[PDB]
Amino acid sequence: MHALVQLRGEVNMHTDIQDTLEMLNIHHVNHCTLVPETDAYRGMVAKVNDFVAFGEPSQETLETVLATRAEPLEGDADVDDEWVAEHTDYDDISGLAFALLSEETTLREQGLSPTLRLHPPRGGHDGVKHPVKEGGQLGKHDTEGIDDLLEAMR
Amino acid sequence: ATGPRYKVPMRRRREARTDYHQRLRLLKSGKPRLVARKSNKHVRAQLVTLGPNGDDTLASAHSSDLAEYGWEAPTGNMPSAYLTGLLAGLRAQEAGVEEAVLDIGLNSPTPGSKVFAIQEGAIDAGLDIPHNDDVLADWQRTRGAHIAEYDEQLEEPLYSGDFDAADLPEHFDELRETLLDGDIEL
Amino acid sequence: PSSNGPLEGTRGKLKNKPRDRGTSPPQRAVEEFDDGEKVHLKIDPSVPNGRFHPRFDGQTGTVEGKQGDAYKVDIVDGGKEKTIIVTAAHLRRQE
Amino acid sequence: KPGAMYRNSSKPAYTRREYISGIPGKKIAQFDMGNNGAGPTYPAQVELVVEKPVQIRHNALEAARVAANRYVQNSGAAANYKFRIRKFPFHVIRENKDGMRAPFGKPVGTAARVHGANHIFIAWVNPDPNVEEAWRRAKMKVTPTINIDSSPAGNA
Amino acid sequence: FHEMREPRIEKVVVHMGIGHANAEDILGEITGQMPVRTKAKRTVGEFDIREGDPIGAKVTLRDEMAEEFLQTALPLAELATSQFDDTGNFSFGLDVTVNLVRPGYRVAKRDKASRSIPTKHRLNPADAVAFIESTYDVEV
RNA sequence: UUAGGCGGCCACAGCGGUGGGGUUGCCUCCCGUACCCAUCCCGAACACGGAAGAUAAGCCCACCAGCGUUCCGGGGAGUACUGGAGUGCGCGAGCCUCUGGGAAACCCGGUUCGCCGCCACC
RNA sequence: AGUGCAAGAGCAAAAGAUAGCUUGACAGUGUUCUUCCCAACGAGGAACGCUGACGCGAAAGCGUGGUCUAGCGAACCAAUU
RNA sequence: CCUGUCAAACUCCAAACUUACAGACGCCGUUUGACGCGGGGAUUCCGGUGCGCGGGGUA
Numbered sequence: 001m002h003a004l005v006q007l008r009g010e011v012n013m014h015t016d017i018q019d020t021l022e023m024l025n026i027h028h029v030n031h032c033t034l035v036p037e038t039d040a041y042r043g044m045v046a047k048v049n050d051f052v053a054f055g056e057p058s059q060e061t062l063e064t065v066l067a068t069r070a071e072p073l074e075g076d077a078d079v080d081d082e083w084v085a086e087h088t089d090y091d092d093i094s095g096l097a098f099a100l101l102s103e104e105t106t107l108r109e110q111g112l113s114p115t116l117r118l119h120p121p122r123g124g125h126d127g128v129k130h131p132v133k134e135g136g137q138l139g140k141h142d143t144e145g146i147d148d149l150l151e152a153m154r
Numbered sequence: 155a156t157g158p159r160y161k162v163p164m165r166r167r168r169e170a171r172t173d174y175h176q177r178l179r180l181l182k183s184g185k186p187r188l189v190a191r192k193s194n195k196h197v198r199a200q201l202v203t204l205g206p207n208g209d210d211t212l213a214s215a216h217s218s219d220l221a222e223y224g225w226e227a228p229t230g231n232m233p234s235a236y237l238t239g240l241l242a243g244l245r246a247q248e249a250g251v252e253e254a255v256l257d258i259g260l261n262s263p264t265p266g267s268k269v270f271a272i273q274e275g276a277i278d279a280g281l282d283i284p285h286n287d288d289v290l291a292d293w294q295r296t297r298g299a300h301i302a303e304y305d306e307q308l309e310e311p312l313y314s315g316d317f318d319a320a321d322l323p324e325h326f327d328e329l330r331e332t333l334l335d336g337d338i339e340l
Numbered sequence: 341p342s343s344n345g346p347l348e349g350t351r352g353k354l355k356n357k358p359r360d361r362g363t364s365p366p367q368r369a370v371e372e373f374d375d376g377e378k379v380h381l382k383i384d385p386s387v388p389n390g391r392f393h394p395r396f397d398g399q400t401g402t403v404e405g406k407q408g409d410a411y412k413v414d415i416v417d418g419g420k421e422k423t424i425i426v427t428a429a430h431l432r433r434q435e
Numbered sequence: 436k437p438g439a440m441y442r443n444s445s446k447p448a449y450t451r452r453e454y455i456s457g458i459p460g461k462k463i464a465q466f467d468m469g470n471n472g473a474g475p476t477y478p479a480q481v482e483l484v485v486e487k488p489v490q491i492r493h494n495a496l497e498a499a500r501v502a503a504n505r506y507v508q509n510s511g512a513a514a515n516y517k518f519r520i521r522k523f524p525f526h527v528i529r530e531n532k533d534g535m536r537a538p539f540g541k542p543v544g545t546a547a548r549v550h551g552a553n554h555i556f557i558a559w560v561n562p563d564p565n566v567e568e569a570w571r572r573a574k575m576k577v578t579p580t581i582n583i584d585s586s587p588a589g590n591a
Numbered sequence: 592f593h594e595m596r597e598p599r600i601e602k603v604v605v606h607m608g609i610g611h612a613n614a615e616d617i618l619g620e621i622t623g624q625m626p627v628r629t630k631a632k633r634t635v636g637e638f639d640i641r642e643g644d645p646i647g648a649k650v651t652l653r654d655e656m657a658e659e660f661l662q663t664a665l666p667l668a669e670l671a672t673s674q675f676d677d678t679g680n681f682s683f684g685l686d687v688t689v690n691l692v693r694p695g696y697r698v699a700k701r702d703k704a705s706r707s708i709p710t711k712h713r714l715n716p717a718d719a720v721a722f723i724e725s726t727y728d729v730e731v
Numbered sequence: 732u733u734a735g736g737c738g739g740c741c742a743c744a745g746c747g748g749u750g751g752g753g754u755u756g757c758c759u760c761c762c763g764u765a766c767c768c769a770u771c772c773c774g775a776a777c778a779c780g781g782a783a784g785a786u787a788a789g790c791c792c793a794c795c796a797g798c799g800u801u802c803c804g805g806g807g808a809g810u811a812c813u814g815g816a817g818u819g820c821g822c823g824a825g826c827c828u829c830u831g832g833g834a835a836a837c838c839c840g841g842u843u844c845g846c847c848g849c850c851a852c853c
Numbered sequence: 854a855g856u857g858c859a860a861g862a863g864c865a866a867a868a869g870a871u872a873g874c875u876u877g878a879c880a881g882u883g884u885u886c887u888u889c890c891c892a893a894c895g896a897g898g899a900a901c902g903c904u905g906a907c908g909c910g911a912a913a914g915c916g917u918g919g920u921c922u923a924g925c926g927a928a929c930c931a932a933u934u
Numbered sequence: 935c936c937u938g939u940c941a942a943a944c945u946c947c948a949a950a951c952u953u954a955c956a957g958a959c960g961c962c963g964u965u966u967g968a969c970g971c972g973g974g975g976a977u978u979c980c981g982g983u984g985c986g987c988g989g990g991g992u993a
């Protein structure tokens with residue numbers, strides 16, 4: 001399970017690429033989704049590779065973000081442990097996070113919006129003109145790599 | 155053989171055994187084929203159907219297993235052919251086969267030929283086959299009359315020991331007669 | 341194109357590789373299909389008749405009745421529904 | 436006319452003589468020079484390596500070749516060495532000599548397409564590299580920058 | 592092994608390659624059976640432009656008709672060697688050709704399952720000279 | 732399948748070459764032209780009638796890789812080329828990096844001297 | 854190689870050659886594709902059927918002209934069945 | 935035998951890629967009726983630029 005974060009806008013990006021991000025529930029810059037590592041999902045993120053940031057986040061990080069940026073399928077309601085417990089199969093955020101990571105369920109299955117609309121990265125990100133291996137913020141990241149980004153946009 | 159571009163004919167064309175252009179016209183009818191084949195000493199008659207991995211033979215008759223019914227004469231002649239035809243025709247019927255077309259392979263459509271004899275026999279057995287009566291032998295030759303008369307010009311037995319000296323087109327009737335009722339494997 | 345006949349630019353798709361050259365096996369020209377089957381359309385360079393317009397080589401349609409020995413296969417050209425008159429010789433079972 | 440007009444490999448390959456007529460004959464005199472009776476049985480083997488893919492008109496091939504071999508007469512008219520220009524001008528070139536109307540030009544020449552890093556010239560010498568000099572003069576008359584490379588020769 | 596390996600005469604073709612005939616008659620008597628026309632191919636300067644056109648005849652003799660003929664033909668010939676085929680044949684003379692081969696030749700002449708004869712089972716020039724020479728005459 | 736008939740795939744089956752096999756049975760060569768039939772001339776062939784002889788052909792069986800073919804290892808080669816991205820480089824031609832794909836020739840070593848189906852059959 | 858003619862393509866117990874026989878280059882009416890990719894548009898073209906009448910072949914079958922893709926033409930008026 | 939080179943109208947080979955159909959996941963539609971069908975009204979048929987691939991042209 002990888003965390004997907006659109007870092008580049010729609011203007012000028014191929015339509016078949018945009019449609020893919022839209023198929024992955026991301027319709028704005030900085031919006032983030034959690035995607036299982038399957039052949040079918042793998043092909044999709046590869047096509048989206050140049051306009052996004054992805055990787056496998058740590059239990060903790062996912063937890064911080066879930067708590068800070070998760071939302072109900074509809075409404076303002078904060079998704080805190082109580083919410084998770086009184087609305088999901090799990091007892092608390094950590095419970096959910098673990099399940100997500102182990103790809104046992106998904107944000108929809110648990111009545112949650114498939115998108116974690118994050119905040120602009122605090123301190124700024126490494127650039128949308130180069131990939132990670134180059135000092136950029138594009139492409140696959142380290143678990144420690146993705147964690148910093150996700151955390152900075154907490 | 156020569157190079158990558160060389161064209162090797164189909165195996166059954168190399169072996170000079172199957173005429174594929176005729177085969178295709180044959181398969182067009184969508185009916186079973188009445189395979190009429192010969193050998194220096196024998197005559198075979200098969201009813202073939204089309205199959206996923208090749209042809210399927212649903213009924214056959216060989217001039218050799220003819221004696222099995224009381225044949226005591228040679229097996230590479232006209233009377234032999236007819237009978238083998240009738241025998242396979244009958245086994246065919248038993249197999250639920252009702253119609254077929256005459257495949258005479260690489261043989262020639264010569265009038266009164268054994269292949270047409272085989273065709274006449276299969277027909278009489280009850281099989282429905284598209285044919286042409288006046289391309290067939292005149293019954294007597296089918297019986298083996300041409301050979302009995304040939305032995306009339308005797309001086310020396312036409313048959314080395316075998317059976318009879320003056321041969322028997324009658325032995326032919328006795329057998330056809332036999333085949334037209336009861337008996338095993340029919 | 342410089343011309344607009346049906347064989348325009350069909351040099352490749354209507355030619356056999358040197359080794360598949362010459363009359364084709366009769367097994368496949370007699371194959372029987374049932375209404376509803378999915379069949380791949382490909383012209384046999386070696387088989388003259390029963391052909392369909394070269395543009396449809398590659399299509400995978402649905403057998404829906406026949407006309408004579410030839411089959412009537414429904415396809416969809418871009419967004420248009422069409423019916424193609426083709427013989428077994430130029431059809432293959434999908435899967 | 437200037438090399439500027441034909442030195443790039445931007446056009447389609449045009450070489451089918453069965454569809455092209457009136458192609459000018461090549462100005463390249465020979466491809467094999469020196470002792471062509473003998474086979475490459477020499478200690479040293481230097482080569483002239485083009486450093487960028489380019490088109491070289493038979494014009495420049497001949498001037499480059501002549502300037503090199505004509506110089507290799509620092510060894511003598513029947514000296515002990517063998518020189519080879521391995522490329523041949525296959526690429527037919529036109530010129531549009533009406534303005535841009537019906538502009539497909541008319542064959543005016545031929546050039547050889549050389550890819551960066553191929554060797555256009557190969558000489559064979561005994562420890563007597565006057566050839567290295569025959570090439571400083573050769574790449575002097577061909578568009579690209581070039582690399583004078585020595586192969587069998589650890590006799591430095 | 593032998594018996595089925597020993598040579599034999601298969602057809603003797605006697606043909607008169609004229610250039611436009613009355614000659615059939617003599618071929619008829621010299622052999623004993625009707626001659627066959629010899630059409631020609633290609634249009635040529637020897638006022639021989641006609642494609643289908645009688646320009647000679649031939650006669651293929653088999654069995655006795657062939658021996659009974661060679662029993663006078665051969666005597667009228669001297670030659671031998673070099674003038675022999677690589678398959679053990681030879682032509683001398685009005686032409687008279689003699690095709691020689693061993694017992695299982697039909698295998699290559701029939702319709703069904705036909706097959707080319709193996710080089711080993713072929714007849715060599717030498718094995719040919721022997722056979723004929725051993726039948727009323729001398730080689731070279 | 733101790734030798735057969737009809738096939739499917741249509742060279743992995745082609746080309747060439749070696750050894751073995753028929754005492755009654757099968758295929759052949761083979762023997763033979765009164766008949767059906769036959770050669771623009773020939774029972775060569777085609778067709779018909781038949782066993783005195785043979786295992787030399789064919790055919791069946793076992794095997795050989797020199798040529799051709801099929802597939803595989805290792806090398807060539809993650810090379811050539813390429814879908815996506817770049818305020819990376821270069822006067823430019825063009826190149827480079829990240830991401831997803833990925834060859835051909837050729838060399839060396841294996842593989843391949845057909846596989847399979849139906850019927851009939853000491 | 855040949856297959857009438859461009860070019861590309863098809864074809865070997867043939868689609869080529871030879872022989873013989875025959876007029877299916879037949880009347881009628883359609884289905885489909887093409888013309889016009891997608892996507893509407895006429896004449897024309899092709900493939901594939903059926904009804905009828907025929908040719909050849911033992912027969913399956915083949916023949917809706919020539920192996921395939923060029924060789925074509927509206928209304929009005931005339932002449933013709 | 936050896937040795938030196940090529941192809942838009944060459945091919946013993948052969949991608950990336952484009953593409954028909956089917957299944958899966960995704961996304962979407964069944965009060966926002968998708969897919970599709972019928973009808974009304976148009977505008978439009980001077981385009982341009984970057985990037986990739988081009989063809990012509992010294993440019």
Ligand SMILES: [Cl-]
Nearest residue numbers: 191192259261
């Ligand atoms: Cl037979």
Ligand SMILES: [Cl-]
Nearest residue numbers: 392393424886
């Ligand atoms: Cl069509």
Ligand SMILES: [Mg+2]
Nearest residue numbers: 072073074075
């Ligand atoms: Mg909401």
Ligand SMILES: [Mg+2]
Nearest residue numbers: 121122123124
């Ligand atoms: Mg700030």
Ligand SMILES: [Mg+2]
Nearest residue numbers: 125126127128
């Ligand atoms: Mg920045």
Ligand SMILES: [Mg+2]
Nearest residue numbers: 349351352353
């Ligand atoms: Mg092309």
Ligand SMILES: [Mg+2]
Nearest residue numbers: 751752786787
């Ligand atoms: Mg033997």
Ligand SMILES: [Mg+2]
Nearest residue numbers: 388389919920
């Ligand atoms: Mg036609």
Ligand SMILES: [Mg+2]
Nearest residue numbers: 927928929930
């Ligand atoms: Mg008018």
Ligand SMILES: [Mg+2]
Nearest residue numbers: 931932933934
């Ligand atoms: Mg008129």
Ligand SMILES: [Mg+2]
Nearest residue numbers: 951952953987
């Ligand atoms: Mg394309």
Ligand code: NA
Nearest residue numbers: 360362364386
């Ligand atoms: Na074929």
Ligand code: NA
Nearest residue numbers: 533534536537
């Ligand atoms: Na002008």
Ligand code: NA
Nearest residue numbers: 574577578579
């Ligand atoms: Na220079």
Ligand code: NA
Nearest residue numbers: 628630645771
């Ligand atoms: Na004549």
Ligand code: NA
Nearest residue numbers: 786787788789
């Ligand atoms: Na043998």
